[PDB]
Each structure stands twice: as structure tokens, then as C-alpha cells.
Amino acid sequence: MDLIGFGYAALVTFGSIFGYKRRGGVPSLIAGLFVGCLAGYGAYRVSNDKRDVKVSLFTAFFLATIMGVRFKRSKKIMPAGLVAGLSLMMILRLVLLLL
Numbered sequence: 001m002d003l004i005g006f007g008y009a010a011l012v013t014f015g016s017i018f019g020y021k022r023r024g025g026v027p028s029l030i031a032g033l034f035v036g037c038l039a040g041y042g043a044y045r046v047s048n049d050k051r052d053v054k055v056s057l058f059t060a061f062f063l064a065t066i067m068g069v070r071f072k073r074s075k076k077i078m079p080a081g082l083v084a085g086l087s088l089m090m091i092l093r094l095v096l097l098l099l
Contacts, residue, residue: 032085035059053093060086 016022039059043052050058063082064070071079 028081029085035063036085036089056086056089056093059089 036056036059039055040052042049043055049055060082067079067082069079071083073080077084
């Protein structure tokens with residue numbers, strides 16, 4: 001949409017994003033951030049919940065279990081997306097290790 005300066009858009013995007021005061025859809029990802037968060041964070045707290053990493057496993061497991069229809073290649077990205085989430089997590093964990 002519109003073939004105008006990109007960089008600029010990347011600038012305003014970066015800033016605005018940082019200010020976080022525009023979005024407002026709450027499709028699901030958000031819910032994934034909250035849940036996943038508690039998962040990781042909690043695992044980091046070390047109170048009772050299992051250890052990190054595994055948590056994620058329990059996150060995807062619970063979610064899927066909540067869904068009913070286990071992952072399955074098909075239209076939309078509702079199911080696949082989930083896999084994209086868990087994956088994204090792992091990767092982030094690959095670096096987290098260092099962090």
C-alpha cells in the first residue's frame with residue numbers, strides 16, 4: 001500500500017511501537033504472550049512450577065489440549081501458528097541460554 005519512503009515508516013514504527021499506544025486487536029498472540037509469559041517468568045521465579053523450557057512444552061500442550069484438534073496442515077494459520085509460537089520460543093531460548 002502506497003510506494004513511499006520505507007525507512008521513515010520504519011522509524012515512526014519503531015518509535016510509536018516503543019510508545020505502544022495504537023494497536024488494539026487482541027487476536028490471540030496477546031493471550032499467547034500473557035500465558036507464555038507466566039510460563040517463562042514463573043519458571044524463572046522458581047517457586048513450584050516446573051523449570052524453564054519444559055514450561056513452554058506444557059504451554060503448547062495445554063493450549064492444544066484446549067483446542068481439541070491437534071496440529072494438522074490445513075487452511076488458515078490458527079493451528080500452524082501455534083507451532084510457529086512454540087518454535088519462536090525455542091529459538092528465543094537458544095539465545096536466552098546465553099543471556
